[PDB]
């Protein structure tokens, strides 16, 4: 039950992982979660605002 | 053909119309709703007053002067003595609700000034005396606004609050309060400000007398200024509507 | 992958991206090519080190304390909390609610204390670390029967080996931990403010199992927290002021920022 | 935790020492006042002082409340 | 026994290691997750939000709301300066305490474009035109409007829309710049000038203020996580 | 998975779930929605930590004892039993009959004793632990030939290493162990009561293999039991009273519970 | 002869195990047995008792 | 020798670890199982049984 | 939905925004371009600085008084000492270019007055 | 615990060993590569280039 | 594989491989069989040890420094750089621009210092090594709060174990490192020459976590660099002269080479 | 995810490798890169020079 | 790093001690002259000496500039 994942590499390879314990709080940190969604804190308006259009008309 | 400046909001038996509005800020992109079956823990059937509780309540007005530091209101405390919202939180042990906050301030073109209206979650404040904690009377004003100070408060074995405006009572930079849902009342452009806040807590419901989930702060970043002969008395009015309010744990009225 | 610059040329139109209304509460989303001519620049940069995990997942000393093999202080105790130190507290309080597992490490060291005792030959020292969850019996003495650790977790460790390390899961009765609590534990609103039972994680006890020598020795234990598997909600403004207490947010009023000589000065005064 | 651990009582003088016990606290309860009176398993005003009232009825008077592992203190200036 | 050989680094504690360890509570059932608003997954979602800049951080203005106000008035002339500060996002005291600056002071490096938003807060009658300018390094800072006119600028006309945004692009020889002070990785200068005078009618205030907000563009990123020089400690907090 | 609440409304009928007869010996199986209106609450809770395995499978100190490298006490002995300590005994005696494998751990420590001897340099100490099954020869001295351990299991251990650990299976001649025995080993009914040979697990012996130094040293061994692969039958009421002996169930009469001020008092007096 | 099982995880992943010894008293504890049957100690009556019906008639 | 690196926590005794250890009696044959009444598998089967409450716990 | 009063013009590293503009007048209906092969006479290869020369240059400001007669500027002379436009006309013998001229004057509603802005070819005086 | 035996050479530092070690900066993003002229992959590409010989290396 | 000799015989032609023009800047590519008769010799030689990797990938001592458990020097500091030593500096400077990961090793040793203190028994010593990236707070004392290492990488190590070892990636803001910089950091051209911020790698701090004994002890740390995953560009002439400084290329003029007796002497004088 | 490669051997066998970490700066050195191209430093002329032909004509 | 850390001033004598601070340097700034004057948190010629001018106005005079971890010195022979 081995997991093969990709390593952090430069721009312009794999590693193997096996879990030994039974609790899942014993596992290693999730360092490869690169999900973003800034539209909650930024631009949180009810009506959408187009960039080229005047904010108030 | 219409104007994005004119907006009307209708809730229960109340309706607010503004001819000069920037827009509506919606919490964290989340419209308020009721608690779902797969997120609940308390097992009795909830009560939902709807039109009776979800409606606009208008509070006392404050006067914006040329030297005013700012005002704050704990949302649950602000409406704790108002109508059936107050009665329902008096007879119940658990409550849950969101808000629509509308701030109002009009003036003529000559009048200048800018206010920040911000809804801050868990606005835990600090006492002037380092060993002590701020008194409930000092932290909460149910029917009256709480005022900030400009000068620092003196610490002499008291239970006062460090109401310094440039620290926002929370010992943080006041200019960085923009992460929280907010809108700016700029007298030359704006007339009113509107925020729709959802229920924000680490628990599915909470007791509404010993915990204030959110605090409303109004802070003038640019002072109020007018030339002689213009109106000198300029008020600010706050109107708040609970949204999707539900209550559990019916028992004898009272908080102890 | 971070965004890539788009190439633009000259413009003459009624499109106005540079003009907006900040009163709306909205951050403008203008690119550089909205106000100047730009070339095409493919960008290979990545925001991998700015994730909440990488930002929080490093070990940090949160407390250290001493005990001796002889004399009044034979054992040490400490209520687990990350608010005693400044650095991890300030990083954690970027948010209102957090949810994480913990990785716990200990660094135990010993030092010989001055005395007139002679012919001192010391045996190796073993230490016991015991975690008591909130509600259980606590040791009134070094030889207290509670050290039996029938149910309470314990870690025995001998000087010269690797540091001991264990994993602790999310233990909150509430769905998420709380960094801030605007309220009281009493419905009357009397009593201490900003205090609740959501983030109570129990107490830690430490002792020598043997005394080792006929002369005096003093041990120190240092505790290290590492948050794992992190979730966080509601961003908050960073702490401008110097922490004063562990239990509350009290502070001393401080200037918004540093002061320069004038509004056109390009240096820091 | 003691409520208002710093205050000045200016004036029978009632010195409040109301306290709270953490779930972690489980050791024996010991109460001491300083300037005078000690409670172990001036006169205390509450018969049920164990519940959380260590107040007494009469410089600086210090109330020490100790339940392992918690330790709390309160200083009152009687004028 | 399978024959093994232990390599250098055995039994060491490196505070940034990523290993599996035994759980001290076996089979503990955690509290389920509820849906909370405002979840964060990257510190660059916070950096991309505006926050008010204290440009007038001179003397006792810092202990007041006056640090955030930029004064403007009606002059008997034109072309005089309004403000100036350098492009030092994490080191300059104008930026170091803003939401972007606080986040930057945890990282050695930074890269990307920046957005400065300026909002007019005078009477509706008050009219004005302003030149907002950025100069890349190599010469000094401009001392006159004409010198500033030669760099990257916007001419802001005040009217119905009260907010104007000045984008500072990434014009650097390296891909990254040090957050700490450094003459090799110099950033440039940011200035403001009066394109035309402030003009008001009778019975309107001829003195006004302007506000500034700083936010990051979508090509911004940071590197090398480090400790902040902002919080300190002498004894354990209690 | 624990059960989930079912939603109910108002009722008016001859169905009577709240009324029953406790004389039957039957526990009523009423849900909350039998006596009130309830919402639908999916429950994700799990009873994973309440299994007999997790409840019993933690190491526990059951005994500790000393010996010296010189003088009268050169070796230690102990008849294996879990009734000497309070905590594991009380957990185990929730049941009448148990059946488990054992995991055995030892924590051995040494301390230098006061003396006038000079120029003391100590070599490393090795210890021998020997288990003798019931019936075999036992060591009359530290140098006794029985330490040859030709058949008896032995564990040699040098100070500074990991604790020694071994697995022991179910050794009872009977199908299951017995926590309680209402009877005698003599058919006449004379002799000691509550004593039988079902749970006899042999004796443990411990010694220094070398003396190490020219000065006096004293070692202590602590024994830890961990039950594995557990089976249990017939639940029993928990021990209200303080244990007095290891061999029997003797006790001192104690109040059913603590006393309050009255039948309407909401606090503990 | 590796065994892949599921770890304890929260609501709302695998681990691998190999046995090294020959006795089966050497194995690890069985911590995932979630079988329940309370009807022996509770409700142990000869005739079944329906909830809505009177206990004695 | 396969090259290895020992991590923190090596050679420590954590009283709630779950590891395989060598048996001190190899190939011992245990007593078979008989069927006994009243087998327990969860402490919540005991909690779900009634027991009499001492409500009048006042004085003697 | 927008307002014909608001216009933005971007050239090189410069951008001008006006919230109150009548419109844009375009020469004689002719947008500026480069010289074509069938209209040229000089044979060497031309240089085209682009972003370096084509960009907004802002001159000194004049004061409108109640008795001001008016002002004039020769376009080539006005930018003869300004940046790389000036340098390129200094090192070269022939040049060719068009222009975008933006005039700015704001005042309040009470202020009254009207100015003619005109681009006159060959204004020989 | 899988049973193991440590061989001679354990915990030694041989300055020409070739092993994997933990990174002290997890998930650090490096600067991309640009194309530079004159890249070397073998010291024998430098040895194969001429250089002037000092044959008259006598006295001053 | 290296090239193989080709067999040739006698020639008489207008082909002239031995005659060329070195003024072109071109190295002649003549084989031996262009100027003599040769046999066929298959060549099995390999240029495997001449690769830039093998040439550079060995650990090298770059610095060492001391600290004591008592007295004025309680901790050590060092700005990371490979120009302090001669050997790795000279190998690296065969090229203009390099790009590599680093493998870092430490050798920490301790020695007892002379004193009149008596009855000295020493406990084991643990050391802390902390890396501060350029810009962060630095420790003014041994007990400074910055040792909390909330974000800064740290390595704790106890005497008697293997040396500590960690991997560091390429940290340059520029695409490649620079061994040589013909310029100034000031646009004015004033200030220090040959100095830039491209190869700044932060500072290293080292201390005792415990003092261990009542008598004086002095520790030394030695740092070892090993370049990995190497890339290099623009070959440069080797350093003829003896290095004088770490910061610049200053030198003392030296003879092109050694001197013999005459131009026909076959020995070295 | 094991990699089998060839060992350095004499003239006239495999080894196995697995990566354990996630960064790729943690990997071992690349000692088997035997790529050569000396024609940059040597013979860097615009017009090609044949060996048998005179360098200048 | 100090500019020209070795020079001879032959002659009011102006002794230059202009210095630069590495990104690594972050400790407190201390300036000392030797033969006389000390700066900690003969007369210095620059009011903003912190920016990088430790010059003073008046054997061998030594300028010591110390910001942890960097340490720099400059020797000037005044004749």
Decide if F41 contacts F33 (C-beta within 8 A): no
Residue F149 burial by CB count (10 A; 0-12/13-18/19+): exposed, middle or buried?
middle
Phi and psi torsions of K211, nearest 5°? -85, -20
Please compute, for residue J56, the number of CA atoms within 13 A of its CA located in the half-sphere on the CB side.
1
Which of H4, H7, H13 is best to mutate for the E interface (most E CBs within 10 A)?
H7
In a domain, B143, yes or no: yes
What are the Cα distances from residue C39, in Å, to A11, C7, E221, H24?
21, 4, 20, 76
Inter-chain CB proximity J6 and E5 less than 8 Å: yes
d(CA F197, CA F171): 12
Number of domains in chain B: 1
Both structure tokens of D64: 């020490």
Q: CA-based Rg of chain D, rounded to a whole angstrom?
A: 12
Token reading at F214: 């020219």
| CA-based nearest residue to F227, from F51, F46, F47 | F51
Name the residue range of residue B60's domain.
7-250
Judged by phi (left if over 0) then psi (alpha if -120 to 50, else beta), residue M8 lies in beta
Backbone angles phi, psi at K96, to 5 degrees: -90, -45
Within-domain flag for B255: no
Strand, coil or helix: B175 = helix
- Token pair in block for residue M68: 């942890």
Chain B residues in contact with E35 (beta carbon < 8 A): 39
The count of other CB atoms within 10 Å of the CB of residue K267 is: 6
Q: Kind of pairing, strands E127-135 and E13-14? A: unpaired
Q: How far apart are CA E227 and CA K132, in angstroms?
A: 8
CA distances from residue E45 to A30, A35, C234, E180 in whole angstroms, order as listed: 19, 11, 12, 23
The backbone region for B50, taken as left when phi is positive above 0, alpha when psi lies in -120 to 50, beta otherwise, is left
Structure tokens at C111: 């030092």
> Which structure tokens are listed for E184?
């090799």
Write the burial class of residue B12 (CB in 10 Å: 0-12 exposed, 13-18 middle, 19+ buried): middle
Rounded CA-CA distance E164/I19 in Å is 11
- How many structural domains compose chain E? 1
Q: Alpha helix (H) ranges present in chain K? A: 52-56, 87-92
Measured between beta carbons, the chain B residues lying within 8 angstroms of F33 are 43
I90 at interface of C, judged by CB pairs closer than 8 A? no
Q: Among residues K24, I66, K123, B21, which one has the least CA distance to residue C125?
A: K123
The residue behind tokens 């009152």 is: D76
* Nearest of I120, I113, I27, I16 to residue I72 by alpha carbon: I120
Look up residue F122 and give its two tokens. Answer: 């100590």
Please spell the DSSP secondary structure of F25-52, one letter per residue.
S------GGGTS-B--B-------TTBH
The full length of chain E comes to 238
Nearest C-alpha neighbor of B241 from the set B118, B59, B19: B59
Q: Cβ separation of M24 and K140 shorter than 8 Å?
A: no
Put simply, the answer to whether C182 touches B124 (Cβ < 8 Å) is: yes
Distance from CA of B252 to the nearest CA of A (A): 41
Question: How would you label I58-78 residue by residue, b for 16+ Cβ within 10 Å and e otherwise?
Answer: beebeeeeeeeeeeeeeeeee
Nearest to M68 by CA among B69, K205, I29: K205
Q: If residue F56 lies in a helix (H) or strand (E), which one and from where to where?
A: helix F52-56
Token couple for D77: 């200036």
B45, B248, B250: best to mutate for the F interface, most F CBs within 10 A: B45
Beta bridge partners of C221: C65, C108
Tokens, residue D15: 């010195």
Distance, CA of G4 to chain centre: 19
Q: How many CA atoms lie within 13 A of G11 on its CB side?
A: 13
Q: Determine whether D79 is exposed, middle or buried from the number of CB atoms within 10 Å of its CB (0-12, 13-18, 19+).
A: exposed
M19-30 as b/e: b if 16+ CB within 10 A = bbbbbbbbbebe
Beta strands in C69-170 (DSSP E): 75-79, 95-112, 126-132, 154-158, 165-168
Using CA atoms, how far residue B177 sits from B74, E49, E56, L45, in Å, is: 17, 11, 19, 66
Using the beta-carbon criterion (under 8 Å), do I12 and C37 form an inter-chain contact? yes
3-class state of residue E132 by DSSP? strand
Residue C251 sits at φ, ψ, to 5 deg, of -155, 175
Return the structure tokens found at K44: 């099995």
Interface check for J16 against chain H (CB to CB < 8 A): the answer is no
Q: Which residues contact K266 (CB under 8 A, 6 or more apart)?
A: none
Nearest to C128 by CA among C205, C68, C198: C205
Name the minimum distance, in Å, from the CA of H19 to any CA of chain J: 6
**Three-state SS across chain D?**
CECCCEEEECCCCEECCEECCCCCCCCCEEEEEECCCEECCCEECCCCHHHCECCEECCEEEEEEEECCEEEEEEEEEC
The number of residues in chain H equals 60
What are the Cα distances from residue C245, in Å, to B126, C195, E229? 11, 13, 20
What proportions of chain I, in percent to the nearest 5, are helix, strand and coil? 15, 10, 75
Instruction: Retrieve residue E156's tokens.
Output: 């802001």
Residue G15 structural domain: 1-57
Check if B43 contacts F (Cβ < 8 Å). yes
Distance from CA of K54 to the nearest CA of E (A): 20
CB C247 within 8 A of CB C81: no
E103 sits in which H/E element: helix E99-104
- Chains J+L touching (3+ CB pairs under 8 Å): yes
To test the contact with chain F by mutation, choose from B41, B43, B250 the residue with the greatest count of F C-beta atoms within 10 A, namely B43
B121 touches chain C (CB under 8 A): yes
> Cα separation of B49 and B11, whole Å?
13
CA–CA dist L55, I12 (Å, integer): 52
> For this experimental structure, what is the resolution in angstroms?
2.8
Query: With contact defined as beta carbons under 8 Å apart, do F105 and F204 qualify?
Result: no
Q: Which residues contact M79 (CB under 8 A, 6 or more apart)?
A: M8, M9, M10, M11
Strand K217-235 with J39-40, pairing: antiparallel
Q: CA-nearest residue of chain J to A34?
A: J27
Provide the 3-class DSSP secondary structure of residue G40.
coil
Query: Which residue in this structure is represented by tokens 């078979």?
Result: H32
Q: Hey, is B48 helix, strand or coil?
A: coil
What DSSP designation does K63 have? E
- Tokens 């090509």 belong to E219
Q: Is B37 on the interface with F (CB under 8 A)?
A: yes
Listed residue (C167, C136, C106) closest to E26, CA to CA: C167
Q: Is the Cβ–Cβ distance between B54 and B211 less than 8 Å?
A: no
Using what technique was this structure determined? cryo-EM
Question: CB neighbours (10 Å) of residue C244?
Answer: 16
State the total domains in chain A.
1
Q: What is the 3-state secondary structure (H, E, C) of K177-241?
A: CCCCCCCECCCCCCCCECCCCCCCCCEEEEEECCCCCCCCEEEEEEEEEEEEEEEEEEECCCCCC
- Look at chain K and report how many structural domains it folds into: 1
Q: Read off the tokens for E176.
A: 């990254």
Question: What whole-number distance in Å separates Cα of residue C111 and Cα of residue K214?
Answer: 8
Assigned domain for B103 exists: yes
| Spatial distance between the Cα atoms of F106 and F100, rounded to a whole number of angstroms | 19
User: How many CB atoms within 10 Å of residue K215?
Assistant: 20
Interchain contact, C112 vs K120, CB within 8 Å: yes
C19 vs A: CB within 8 A: yes
Residues of K in contact with L37 (CB under 8 A): none
Interchain pair F41, B43: CB under 8 A? yes
Contact assignment for C79 to D69 by CB distance below 8 Å: yes
Which residue in this structure is represented by tokens 């299951």? F176
Q: Residue F72: which domain range?
A: 1-269
Judge if the upstream peptide bond of residue D69 is cis by omega within 30 degrees of 0: yes
Q: Within 10 Å of residue B244's Cβ, how many Cβ atoms?
A: 18
Fill in the DSSP letter of residue B50.
G
DSSP string of H8-58, one letter each residue? TTTT-EETT------BSSTTPPPPPP---SSEESBTHHHHTS--------B
Strand order in the sheet with K126-132: E13-14, K154-158, K126-132, K203-208, K75-79
Longest dimension (CA), chain C: 95
Please, where are the H alpha helices in J1-60?
44-47
Extract long-range pairs of F118-124: CB within 8 Å, 24+ residues apart.
F118/C118, F118/C119, F119/F214, F120/C119, F120/C121, F120/F213, F120/F214, F120/F215, F121/C121, F121/F213, F122/C121, F122/C123, F122/F212, F122/F213, F122/F215, F122/F217, F123/F210, F123/F212, F123/F213, F124/F158, F124/F159, F124/F160, F124/F212
I49 contacts in C (CB within 8 Å)? Answer: none
The tokens of K182 are what?
């013909």
3-state secondary structure of I46: coil
Tokens of C141: 């003495």
């Amino acid at each position: 039950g081995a997991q093969v994942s990709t390593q952090k590499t430069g721009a312009h390879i794999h590693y193997t992982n096996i879990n030994y314990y039974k609790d899942a709080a014993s596992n290693s940190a999730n360092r490869q979660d690169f999900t973003q969604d800034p539209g909650k804190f930024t631009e949180p308006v009810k009506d959408i605002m187009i960039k080229s259009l005047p904010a108030l008309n | 053909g219409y104007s994005d400046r004119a907006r009307s909001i209708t809730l229960g038996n109340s309706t607010i119309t503004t001819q000069e509005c920037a827009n509506v800020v919606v919490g964290y992109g989340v419209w308020p709703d009721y608690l779902k079956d797969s997120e609940a823990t308390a097992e009795d059937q909830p009560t939902q007053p709807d039109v009776a509780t979800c409606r606009f309540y208008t509070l006392d007005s404050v006067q914006w002067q040329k030297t005013s530091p700012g005002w704050w209101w704990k949302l649950p405390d602000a409406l704790s003595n108002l109508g059936l919202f107050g009665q329902n939180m008096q007879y119940h042990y658990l409550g849950r609700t969101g808000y629509t906050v509308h701030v109002q301030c009009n003036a003529s073109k000559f009048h200048q000034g800018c206010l920040l209206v911000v809804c801050v979650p868990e606005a835990e404040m600090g006492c002037a005396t380092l060993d002590n904690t701020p008194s409930s009377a000092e932290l909460l004003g149910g029917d009256s606004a709480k005022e900030f100070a400009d000068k620092p408060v003196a610490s002499g074995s008291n239970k006062l609050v460090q109401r310094v405006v440039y620290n926002a009572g929370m010992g943080v930079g006041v200019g960085n309060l923009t992460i929280f849902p907010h809108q700016w009342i700029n007298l030359r452009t704006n007339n009113s400000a509107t925020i729709v806040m959802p229920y924000t807590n680490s628990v599915p419901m909470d007791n509404m007398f010993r915990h204030n989930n959110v605090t409303l702060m109004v802070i003038p970043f640019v002072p109020l200024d007018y030339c002689p002969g213009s109106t000198t008395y300029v008020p600010i009015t706050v109107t708040i509507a609970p949204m999707c309010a539900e209550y559990n744990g019916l028992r004898l009225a009272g908080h102890q | 992958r971070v965004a890539d610059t788009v190439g633009t040329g000259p413009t003459n139109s009624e499109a106005i991206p540079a003009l907006t209304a900040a009163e709306t509460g909205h951050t403008s989303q203008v690119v550089p090519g909205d106000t100047m001519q730009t070339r095409h620049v493919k960008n290979y940069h990545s925001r991998s080190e700015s994730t909440i995990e990488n930002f929080l997942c490093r070990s940090a000393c949160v407390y250290f304390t001493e005990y001796e093999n002889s004399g009044a202080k034979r054992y040490a105790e400490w209520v687990l909390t990350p608010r005693q130190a400044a650095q991890l507290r300030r990083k954690l309080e970027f948010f209102t609610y957090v949810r994480f597992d913990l990785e716990l490490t200990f660094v135990i060291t010993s030092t010989q204390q001055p005395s007139t005792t002679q012919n001192q030959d010391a045996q190796i020292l073993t230490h016991q670390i015991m975690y008591v969850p909130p509600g259980g019996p606590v040791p009134d003495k070094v030889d207290s029967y509670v050290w039996q650790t029938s149910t309470n977790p314990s870690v025995f460790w001998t000087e010269g080996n690797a540091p001991p390390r264990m994993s602790i899961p999310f233990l909150s009765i509430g769905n998420a931990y709380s960094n801030f609590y605007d309220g009281w534990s009493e419905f009357s609103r009397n009593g201490v403010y900003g205090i609740n039972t959501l983030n109570n994680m129990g107490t830690l006890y430490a002792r020598h199992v043997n005394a080792g020598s006929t002369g005096p020795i003093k041990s120190t234990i240092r505790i290290y927290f590492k948050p794992k598997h992190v979730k966080a909600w509601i961003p908050r403004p960073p702490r401008l002021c110097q922490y004063e207490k562990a239990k509350n947010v009290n502070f001393q009023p401080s200037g918004v920022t540093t002061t320069r000589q004038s509004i056109t000065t390009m240096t820091n005064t | 935790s003691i409520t208002t651990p710093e205050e000045m009582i200016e004036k029978t003088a009632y010195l409040p020492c109301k306290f709270t016990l953490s779930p972690e606290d489980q050791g024996p309860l010991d109460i001491e006042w300083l300037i005078i009176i000690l409670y172990s398993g001036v006169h205390f005003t509450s018969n049920d002082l164990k519940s959380g009232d260590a107040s007494i009825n009469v410089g600086t008077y210090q109330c020490k409340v100790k339940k392992a592992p918690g330790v709390a203190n309160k200083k009152i200036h009687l004028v | 026994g399978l024959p093994t050989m232990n390599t250098p680094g055995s039994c060491q504690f490196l505070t940034s290691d990523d290993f599996q360890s035994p759980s001290a509570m076996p089979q503990y059932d955690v509290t389920p997750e509820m849906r909370i608003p405002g979840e964060v997954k990257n510190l660059m979602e916070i950096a991309e939000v505006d926050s008010v800049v204290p440009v007038q951080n001179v003397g006792e203005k810092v202990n007041s709301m006056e640090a955030y106000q930029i004064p403007v008035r009606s002059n008997e002339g034109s072309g005089t300066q309004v403000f100036g500060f350098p492009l030092q996002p994490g080191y300059s005291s104008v930026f170091s305490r803003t939401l972007l600056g606080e986040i930057l002071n945890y990282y050695t490096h930074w890269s990307g474009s920046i957005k400065l938003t300026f909002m007019f807060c005078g009477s509706a009658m008050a009219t004005g035109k302003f030149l907002l300018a950025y100069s890349p390094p190599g010469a000094g800072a401009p001392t006159k409007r004409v010198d500033a006119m030669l760099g990257t600028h916007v001419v802001w006309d005040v009217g119905l829309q009260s907010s104007c945004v000045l984008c500072i692009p990434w014009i650097s020889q390296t891909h990254y710049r040090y957050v700490t002070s450094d003459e090799y990785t110099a950033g440039g200068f940011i200035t403001c000038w009066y394109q035309t005078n402030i003009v008001v009618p009778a019975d309107a205030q001829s003195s006004c203020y302007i506000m500034c907000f700083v936010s990051a563009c979508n090509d911004f990123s940071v590197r090398l996580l480090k400790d902040t020089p902002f919080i300190s400690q002498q004894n354990f907090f209690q």
